[PDB]
Design a protein around this ligand. Structure first.
Ligand SMILES: Nc1ncnc2c1ncn2[C@@H]1O[C@H](COP(=O)(O)OP(=O)(O)OP(=O)(O)O)[C@@H](O)[C@H]1O
Ligand SMILES: Nc1ccn([C@@H]2O[C@H](COP(=O)(O)CP(=O)(O)OP(=O)(O)O)[C@@H](O)[C@H]2O)c(=O)n1
Ligand SMILES: [Mg+2]
Ligand SMILES: [Mg+2]
Ligand SMILES: [Zn+2]
Lengths: 143, 94, 14, 220, 56, 1111, 170, 108
DNA sequence: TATAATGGGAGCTGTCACGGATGC
DNA sequence: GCATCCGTGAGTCGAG
């Protein structure tokens, strides 16, 4: 980008790379129900480990996995988001076999359902904010 | 630019919260026909017509101007929804 | 592959 | 005060090479095979080209048009891929509480150690939160500080003085927020030059910000 | 003299120091005067305005 | 208004007829003017002779004939039918073994006929068959992309006329043939042909290591027929080897002329390449007893020779224009004719087996339908059959000269790479380097060069003058690229004294490479610069000063120029302007010397010298394909004596025979108040006052009244529930009367239609009871004026079911067509462009008093921003402006030919002559130098524009020669601080106009499967909010705006109805609901065996169908 | 595809404030049509809604009070302008509509860089956000004058362009 | 019949069926007109006594599906069939008189 | 409701780039 | 463990 005279902040590319690094590969299952070679999200395996180390069980051995942008997009947890990207057949078949449920965490799924997106003014952080005036505030303050 | 937009952005921790507040307040002003306004007669948003100045029909201009005065209070879990709706429909029926 | 050819082969058996 | 000169210099319109083609020589031309002709175009656009010169030049023009045409689809496709990868990423919370961070180099490996270019350091620093306290040039930049452009220029000045080597910074790479990134790891919302508001959809912004210049990206 | 870069730095610095609104006003003003002065400036392109150097 | 021309160069040959490609191609294909016995066995005759005789009873082919058209061209245009001729075929049915023959002439249906200008008429609409460019048939040798040493041979026939064949020497060390994606040793095939180890090793053993891989003992051990059967199992598994079927298959693959067909060009290329001669167009022969081969052995020879490094063997260039040919309209039509004919033949055999085998005639044995269907298919729906561009004469003329790489057998737009899109060196003089689409089609859609001609073989040839010694002969040779590569060709600009070369060192080309050469070494010379470029490109003066991209834009945009009611040829032409009008058949000319008898707006009657009195009807205000009005106006007066070729009447856009695409306006180049910012243009109202840039546009409206099960749709005057105000402009029969002015909402044609089965709602019935009124059984279907349309009604056509000459499609009672014309003045948002690629929309119309003006009272017409010039690097507009100024004050026009034309000094002289008129008369009028002019002169002195110390007049002349004049601000009266370039530029108004483009919708039609709004202005549809716009909203924080789009503004039914009602009542819009197209997704997913379920937080199902989909 | 959306050819208004755009009257009439029927009923222009709509269905049936009523309708409101392709989020921006005659949309110069629009015949789409929520979102978040800096690099986006720099430099 | 998937243009982006409007489902304007009508007719029947309105609602089908015979309206209210016809006639007269002055039902 | 008739017929080529799996 | 095969997709608008 610098070569062509485009100023672009590193943070964005970092946002993408972060998603490229999202997945890991199991080296040893340990006490888990997992198996050698199985691929899953880094968050899900660390949540598993921190759970079973508190259960006094052997941790799951794993190595980091770098996959490109397309494959990372298709490997997402949400099947509505994956089916709408590409490989509509493969995604749908594997997800329908797995009996997958889409928890609607992202923007795409919510867009397809026509739901309010979980971002901006649809963010739970700002969504439930209420407005009132001192007159009505005191009027309700009475009771 | 919306007048005093920087102060409005100063009022909240997230710009989107400012948006939610303004929008909700505007819905309140629309429901009750402006009877509930925290603006005094001289502060009322005006609109030039053929005959002469009238009250600004736009509820968002209003809501923002009201917000600029400290006369509004916003936040989460201030009042249950029932109490708010009912008390506002009491003091200002429509 | 080529169902007509297949049926025309199965036919040639009898 | 010449018009061509003034326009090129002000930034209104024009660059040195185009003005060169106007008053200078058009320059070397290239075959469809990619190898250049040994015979340059000696004419300016003022003097006017010979029909052979013109024809020799049309190759590069055609290759350029076909290049833009074929590239737009690749840029767009990339953009859509990026959007589908980053879409779920939004600013979910204020702090994930991570003690992790990244360390931004102010120098790069002629084989030696030399300062980077200002533009680069700015593009890696500006509007970010320090993950550790730094003391340089008698100034304390505290942990949690969002670096202003002036904070950056200061850090560069300190690096020129040998006081600072790398700058510790909160980054999306190290952010522990689930299904997104937090406010501190992100830093400024560069559009408002102030810390990002919780709820801004960061992924889409990253994707679009990467993809948009892609049409201007050189070659194929 | 004021070129693309110095005007860009001006707009940015105005954004930082003054408001968003005031920067918008500064923008509108710069637009107005820029156009106004560009009109009467006498900027034009003739064929003789592309000057072949004697060094060529 | 005299016309002065520049340039040294004299053209030894005129441009060929520009439509000759189309016209001559089709003429060769039909052979309609040739008596049958003299026909050449090409095109249609060739297809007939190729299909017949039909074996088994034998049906042979005697001949064919084309009758005259059932209807004339205009009548076909009006009646929405095809201009065509009946095709009869004389055929004899010979019964084998009865010796009996029955001759009959069988009617085959109709073949479309090309018109004078090279276009067609299909179902009433003018069309154009576009020439396709493709890889020429033949034998090629290409470098193997796998390994450096090896090479791959390819044998290519005509596209539908046979399979491709590859020859490759493997790493295995054996020679392999690839056919139908099946690879087998070439050995076996060679053995099939009667070849022996000895015969092969003798000639082909010159290279031993390579030939030893061709040697397989087990193959030569087999009998030739044993090699035949061995091959048949390999090619098609699943079929039994059969001596009857196996020979028949391999014959049809290779030696069959009716199945495998190499082009005549393929034959020639193969012969010239392999140094052999072909007896036929196949790769082998069936001549008894066994198969005999032509191509395979020499192809193998060339392959091995190229492999070893043997001299005289080189790889072919696929993009070379010797290796790429052109299939023109005639060939493309002939192919489909061959196809339909084949289907007809299969039909004939079928009908020949079935039914009585005793009594049969050619009439009973032949079904015309397949052929008719094939031709109609080709013409009506095809990628190469294109709706003709009628916008201006040059539009059509260019459209006919287009060359497409796409189409059937062509490239896929997605898969086209850099190679085919590139301009090859061999494009010189053949395919125009500048003119193509700027978009995704770039390099795929190209244009035929001016002097370029396509030969019998289909290769493009360009003319070159012969040079013997130093002398230039006037004999002209048209060469292919393959031939051109053999010589040294000098540029056309090189100095000549008489026919002798006057240059000691002359610039030339050897195989495309520019080289400086001795006059003794020159074999040939370019005819003209013109031959390098297309017709549109040749119309840009000063082209040498413009970068190729903006030149491309100018070329393309001339096509888009609309005819103006008063149109003028450019003040600076290229000299090609008249010939373009001539060839395009825009205008009307005198056939012989003679005297003009009568002159009318409608007609021109001319008496010739032989006493014959000929009458020429003028086409007046006819609607073109693009809706631009095409009308001829008389250029002569009663009693005027005219010679042969003299102009009788002017074409739709032309001025006195010269091609006029636009207006000549007085421009000032200078920024004006941000109104010209970023390519926008400032226009003076003085242009609208004098009707400059005003054009006529006719639109056609059509309505059908049909027969319904609910009763007839009637077209009448009385429409239920309408005021007299609405019907005041209506005809007594229900139509609108000619001359009326129609505005949006008004009724063009009244139509009543029987209501569907009615289930009156209780409210409706109670209302009826309250008002005690008719409750009519008919509805108003009447065709009204669309939003943003209107004009004066020029014509009406009315066709009814019972009529003397009228046939309608079944169920239709009547058809009514109203024609509505409008006169469009230039308005803000209309697109303007010049020939150098400068384009922009008018952003402002200032009144004359605000306009910049000269020292005398004359205001400038147009103001163009100079900021557009440097980046774009097209300087031709500047020169055109200078010379336009000179020609403005002198009162003359100019011709500057393309690369040979006016230079700076000559223009400077013309500008001096101009200044003498401009400033000179001012002194005699008793006026000196103005104070403002003095100040401006001081500014210019500081700018180094003028020399210090000279008199004011000397300095003003100094500026004027630089093309700059003092200009006064119209608003102020103060002068512009600098002197400004001002002069006449030729600017045209394009077909893109806001009146057409502006569209808006609140609510409207919705689609069937998905309740989403329709697209397009015509359907009154909504704008598209795409994935990227959705991204734009998500990137902002607007959740509610986005959801509102998705749900509320489209595809949510309850939501949209409730929203409209909410706004109508003045209450805020309801919360969004489930989008219908998601339900569509759910059900379309349930059609597949997958089950989709919306759930709670408790993982309990939620019904989004509200119980309607569940028991 | 959505309702309440138009499209037309853009043309530069130099006179507009940064937060404004010119909107053709004929576009505005159709885009805001329901609001206009309502406001026509709020005045003495039409007996009811159906009468008002029946009045707007013909060009010759439109009065002068209709336009002033339209001016009342759009007061304070914003519309979204969009130019294809939209590469980043600034491909859509919010403006206060200023009714202009003629059929062209007037665009402000300083936003031309962000849309990558020029006057060579570019076209733009207009969308009317309906609810108070959508209007608040557009006015606060998407307003042209509220976005002066690139989200990509913190550098300014709306900054003096060609003619403006030209004048100031001069 | 013809295929709704029949290509439009030489690109891959258009189909025949995309140009076919959906007639069946009511328009937002249509639905608004009906919804406004029910309200104006409910406003008009309020000027009537509750019996006049109820008689007129009963036998016009405004309530409970199909219209009722005036013999059935008579058994409902407890009057003679002649009375119900008369109550309907007087109610209609009241509606015509009222509507004549207001002109709010002109939308039909 | 009855001579006997017993294995089809066309095809259509100038991308690619990975990738995931399959096969030496 | 490498050569090969198949399957998938290749920017947006507008108009046809
Ligand atoms: N394929 C496109 N996608 C998006 N915008 C386009 C496209 N084609 C044209 N435009 C827009 O219209 C402007 C000018 O149009 P352009 O000169 O490219 O041809 P056009 O007017 O669209 O159609 P035509 O090729 O018939 O002239 C462009 O600058 C661009 O903004
Ligand atoms: N198929 C297409 C064709 C065009 N476009 C768009 O239209 C513009 C024209 O570019 P352009 O190169 O013609 C003019 P510009 O970019 O302003 O350069 P200049 O003014 O300095 O001379 C592009 O910027 C694209 O956004 C598109 O998206 N898809
Ligand atoms: Mg531009
Ligand atoms: Mg443009
Ligand atoms: Zn974090």
């Amino acid at each position: 980008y610098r070569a062509q005279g485009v100023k672009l902040h590193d943070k964005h590319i970092e946002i993408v790379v972060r998603q490229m690094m999202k997945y890991v590969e199991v080296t040893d299952p340990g006490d888990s129900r997992l198996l050698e070679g199985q691929v899953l999200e880094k968050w899900d395996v660390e949540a598993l480990n921190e759970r079973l180390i508190a259960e006094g069980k052997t941790p799951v051995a794993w190595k980091p996995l770098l996959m490109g942008v397309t494959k990372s997009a298709l490997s997402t947890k949400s099947w509505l988001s994956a089916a709408s990207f590409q490989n509509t057949t493969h995604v749908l078949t594997e997800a329908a076999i797995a009996g997958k449920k889409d928890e609607l965490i992202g923007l795409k799924e919510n867009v397809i359902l026509g739901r309010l997106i979980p971002a901006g003014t649809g963010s739970d952080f700002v969504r439930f904010t209420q407005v009132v005036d001192q007159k009505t505030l005191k009027a309700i303050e009475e009771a | 630019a919306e007048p005093g937009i920087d102060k409005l952005f100063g009022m909240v921790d997230s710009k989107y919260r400012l948006t939610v507040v303004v929008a909700k307040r505007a819905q309140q002003l629309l429901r009750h026909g402006f009877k509930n306004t925290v603006l005094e007669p001289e502060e009322r948003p005006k609109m030039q017509t053929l005959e002469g100045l009238f009250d600004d029909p736009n509820a968002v201009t209003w809501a923002m101007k009201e917000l600029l005065t400290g006369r509004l209070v916003f936040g989460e879990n201030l009042v249950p929804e029932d109490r708010l709706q009912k008390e506002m429909e009491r003091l200002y029926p429509v | 592959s080529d169902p007509v050819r297949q049926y025309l082969h199965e036919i040639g058996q009898v | 005060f010449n018009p061509l000169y003034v326009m090129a210099q002000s930034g209104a319109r024009g660059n040195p090479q185009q003005i060169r083609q106007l008053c200078g020589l058009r320059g070397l031309m290239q075959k469809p095979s990619g190898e250049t002709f040994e015979v340059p175009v000696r004419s300016s656009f003022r003097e006017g080209l010979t029909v052979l010169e013109y024809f020799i030049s049309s190759h590069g023009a055609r290759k350029g048009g076909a290049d833009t045409a074929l590239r737009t689809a690749d840029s767009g496709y990339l953009t859509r891929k990026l959007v589908d990868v980053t879409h779920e990423i939004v600013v979910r919370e204020a702090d994930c509480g991570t003690t992790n961070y990244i360390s931004v180099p102010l120098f790069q490996p002629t084989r030696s150690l030399r300062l980077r270019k200002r533009a680069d350091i700015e593009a890696g620093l500006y509007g970010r939160v320090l993950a550790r306290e730094v003391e340089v040039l008698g100034v304390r930049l505290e942990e949690g500080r969002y670096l202003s452009m002036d904070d950056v220029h200061l850090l560069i000045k300190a690096a020129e003085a040998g006081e600072i080597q790398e700058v510790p910074v909160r980054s999306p790479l190290t952010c522990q927020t689930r299904y997104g990134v937090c406010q501190k790891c992100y830093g400024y919302d560069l559009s408002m030059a102030r810390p990002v508001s919780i709820g801004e959809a960061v992924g889409i912004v990253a994707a679009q910000s990467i993809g948009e210049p892609g049409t201007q990206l050189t070659m194929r | 003299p004021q070129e693309k870069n110095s005007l860009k730095d001006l707009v940015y610095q105005a954004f930082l120091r003054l408001g968003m609104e005031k920067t918008a006003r500064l923008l509108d003003a710069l637009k107005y005067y820029g156009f106004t002065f560009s009109t009467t400036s006498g900027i034009t392109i003739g064929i003789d305005d592309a000057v072949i150097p004697e060094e060529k | 208004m005299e016309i002065k021309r520049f340039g040294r160069i004299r053209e030894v040959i005129p441009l060929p007829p520009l439509t000759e490609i189309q016209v001559e191609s089709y003429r060769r294909a039909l052979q309609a003017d040739v008596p049958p016995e003299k026909r050449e066995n090409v095109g249609i005759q060739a297809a007939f002779r190729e299909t017949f005789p039909i074996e088994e009873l034998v049906l042979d082919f005697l001949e064919y004939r084309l009758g005259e058209p059932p209807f004339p061209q205009d009548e076909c245009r009006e009646k929405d039918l095809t201009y065509q001729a009946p095709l009869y075929a004389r055929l004899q049915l010979i019964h084998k073994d009865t010796g009996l023959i029955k001759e009959d002439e069988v009617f085959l249906g109709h073949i479309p006929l090309m018109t004078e200008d090279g276009s067609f008429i299909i179902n009433g609409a003018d069309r154009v068959i576009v020439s396709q460019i493709h890889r020429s048939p033949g034998v090629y040798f290409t470098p193997d992309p796998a390994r450096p040493g090896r090479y791959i041979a390819s044998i290519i026939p005509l596209p539908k006329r046979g399979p491709w064949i590859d020859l490759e020497v493997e790493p295995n060390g054996v020679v392999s043939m690839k056919v139908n994606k099946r690879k087998f040793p070439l050995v076996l095939l060679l053995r099939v042909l009667g070849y022996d180890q000895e015969t092969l090793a003798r000639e082909l053993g010159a290279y031993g290591e390579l030939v030893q891989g061709l040697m397989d003992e087990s193959v030569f051990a087999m009998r030739p027929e044993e090699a035949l059967i061995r091959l048949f199992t390999l090619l098609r598994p699943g079929d039994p080897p059969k001596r009857d079927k196996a020979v028949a298959y391999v014959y049809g693959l290779i030696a069959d002329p009716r199945r495998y067909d190499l082009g005549e060009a393929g034959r020639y290329k193969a012969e010239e390449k392999l140094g052999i001669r072909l007896s036929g167009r196949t790769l082998a022969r069936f001549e008894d007893g066994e198969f005999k081969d032509e191509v395979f052995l020499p192809t193998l020879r060339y392959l091995f020779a190229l492999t070893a490094g043997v001299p005289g063997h080189e790889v072919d260039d696929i993009d070379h224009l010797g290796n790429r040919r052109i299939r023109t309209v005639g060939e493309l039509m002939t192919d489909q004719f061959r196809v339909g004919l084949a289907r007809l033949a299969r039909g004939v055999r079928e009908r020949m087996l079935m039914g009585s085998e005793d009594s049969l005639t050619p009439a009973k044995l032949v079904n015309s339908r397949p052929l008719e269907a094939a031709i109609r298919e080709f013409f009506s729906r095809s990628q190469l059959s294109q709706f003709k561009d009628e916008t201006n004469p040059l539009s059509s003329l260019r459209h006919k000269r287009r060359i497409s790489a796409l189409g059937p057998g062509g490239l896929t737009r997605e898969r086209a790479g850099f190679d085919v899109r590139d301009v090859h060196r061999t494009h010189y003089g053949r395919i125009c380097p500048v003119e193509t689409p700027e978009g995704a089609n770039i390099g795929l859609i190209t244009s035929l060069a001016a002097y370029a001609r396509v030969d019998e073989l289909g290769f493009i040839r360009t003319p070159y003058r012969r040079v013997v010694g130093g002398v230039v002969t006037d004999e002209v040779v048209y060469m292919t690229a393959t031939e051109e590569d053999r010589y040294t060709i000098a540029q056309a600009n090189t100095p000549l004294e008489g026919n002798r070369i006057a240059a000691e060192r002359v610039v030339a080309r050897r195989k495309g490479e520019p080289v400086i050469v001795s006059p003794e070494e020159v074999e040939f010379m370019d005819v003209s610069p013109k031959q390098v470029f297309s017709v549109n490109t040749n119309l840009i003066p000063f082209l040498e000063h413009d970068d190729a991209n903006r030149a491309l834009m100018g070329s393309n945009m001339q096509t888009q120029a609309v005819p103006l009611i008063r149109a003028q040829a450019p003040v600076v032409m290229t000299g090609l302007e008249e010939r373009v009008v001539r060839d395009s058949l825009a205008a009307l000319y005198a056939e012989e010397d003679g005297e003009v008898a009568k002159v009318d707006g409608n007609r021109i009657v001319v008496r010739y010298e032989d006493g014959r009195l000929v009458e020429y009807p003028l086409r007046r205000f006819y609607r073109s394909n693009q809706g631009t009005a095409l009308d001829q106006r008389p250029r002569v007066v009663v009693g005027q004596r005219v010679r042969k070729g003299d102009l009788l009447a002017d074409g739709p856009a032309s001025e006195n025979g010269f091609l006029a695409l636009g207006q000549n306006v007085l421009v000032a180049i200078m920024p004006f108040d941000g109104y010209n910012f970023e390519d926008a243009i400032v226009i003076s109202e003085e242009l609208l006052k004098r009707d400059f840039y005003t054009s006529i546009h006719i639109e056609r409206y059509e309505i059908e009244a049909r027969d319904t099960k609910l009763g007839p749709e009637r077209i009448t005057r009385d429409i239920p529930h309408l005021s007299e105000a609405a019907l005041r402009d209506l005809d007594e029969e229900g139509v609108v009367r000619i001359g009326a002015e129609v505005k949006p909402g008004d009724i063009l044609v009244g139509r009543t239609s029987f209501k569907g089965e009615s289930e009156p709602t209780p409210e409706e019935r109670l209302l009826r009871s309250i008002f005690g009124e008719k409750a009519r059984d008919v509805k108003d279907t009447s065709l009204r004026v669309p939003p943003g349309e209107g004009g004066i009604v020029v014509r009406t056509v009315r066709l009814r079911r019972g009529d003397p000459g009228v046939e309608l499609k079944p169920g239709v009672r009547e058809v009514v067509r109203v024609y509505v014309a409008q006169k469009r003045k230039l308005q803000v948002g209309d697109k303007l462009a010049n020939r150098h690629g400068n384009k922009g929309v008018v952003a402002k119309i200032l009144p004359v008093e605000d306009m910049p003006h000269l020292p005398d009272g004359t205001p400038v017409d147009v103001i163009l921003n100079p900021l557009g010039v440097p980046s774009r690097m097209n300087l031709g507009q500047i020169l055109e402006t200078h010379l336009g100024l000179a020609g403005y004050f002198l009162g003359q026009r100019y011709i500057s030919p393309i690369f040979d034309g006016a230079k700076e000094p000559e223009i400077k002289e013309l500008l001096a002559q101009a200044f003498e008129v401009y400033f000179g008369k001012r002194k005699g009028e008793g006026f000196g130098v103005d104070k403002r002019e003095v100040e401006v002169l001081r500014r210019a002195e500081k700018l180094g524009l003028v020399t210090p110390g000279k008199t004011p007049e000397e300095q003003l002349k100094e500026l004027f020669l630089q093309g700059k004049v003092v200009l006064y601000d119209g608003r102020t009266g103060e002068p512009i601080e600098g002197p400004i370039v001002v002069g006449q530029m030729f600017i045209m108004k394009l077909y893109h106009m806001v009146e057409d483009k502006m569209h808006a919708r609140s609510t409207g039609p919705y689609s069937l499967i998905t309740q989403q709004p329709l697209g397009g202005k015509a359907q009154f549809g909504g704008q598209r909010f795409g994935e990227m716009e959705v991204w734009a909203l998500e990137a902002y924080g607007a959740a509610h705006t986005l959801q509102e789009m998705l749900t509320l503004k489209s595809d949510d039914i309850e939501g949209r109805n409730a929203a409209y009602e909410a706004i109508i009542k003045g209450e805020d819009v309801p919360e969004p609901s489930v989008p219908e197209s998601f339900r569509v997704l759910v059900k379309e997913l349930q059609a597949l065996a997958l089950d989709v379920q919306t759930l709670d937080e408790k993982d309990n199902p939620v019904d989004i169908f509200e119980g309607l989909a569940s028991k | 595809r959505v309702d309440y959306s138009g499209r037309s050819v853009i043309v530069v208004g130099p006179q507009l404030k940064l937060h404004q755009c010119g909107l053709p009257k004929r576009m505005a009439l159709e885009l805001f049509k329901p609001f206009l029927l309502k406001k026509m009923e709020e005045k003495g222009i039409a007996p009811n809604v159906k009468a008002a709509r029946r009045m707007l269905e013909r060009q010759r049936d439109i009065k002068d009070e209709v336009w002033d009523a339209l001016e009342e309708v759009i007061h304070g409101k914003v519309v979204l302008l969009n130019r294809a392709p939209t590469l980043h989020r600034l491909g859509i921006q919010a403006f206060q509509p200023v009714l202009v005659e003629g059929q062209s949309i007037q665009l402000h110069p300083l936003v031309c860089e962000a849309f990558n629009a020029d006057f060579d015949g570019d076209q733009m789409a207009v969308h009317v956000p309906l609810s108070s929520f959508a209007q608040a979102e557009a006015r606060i978040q998407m307003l042209s004058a509220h976005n002066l800096l690139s989200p990509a690099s913190g550098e300014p986006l709306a900054k003096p362009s060609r003619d403006i720099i030209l004048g100031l430099y001069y | 019949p013809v295929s709704l998937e029949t290509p439009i243009g030489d690109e891959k982006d258009s189909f025949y069926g995309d140009f076919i409007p959906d007639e069946h489902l009511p328009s937002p304007v249509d639905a608004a007109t009906q919804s406004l009508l029910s309200e104006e007719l409910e406003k008009a029947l309020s000027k009537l006594s509750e019996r006049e309105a109820m008689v007129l609602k009963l036998r016009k089908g405004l309530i409970d599906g199909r219209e009722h015979t005036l013999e059935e309206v008579g058994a409902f209210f407890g009057v003679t069939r002649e009375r119900i016809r008369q109550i309907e006639n007087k109610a209609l007269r009241k509606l015509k008189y009222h509507e004549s002055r207001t002109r709010k039902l002109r939308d039909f």
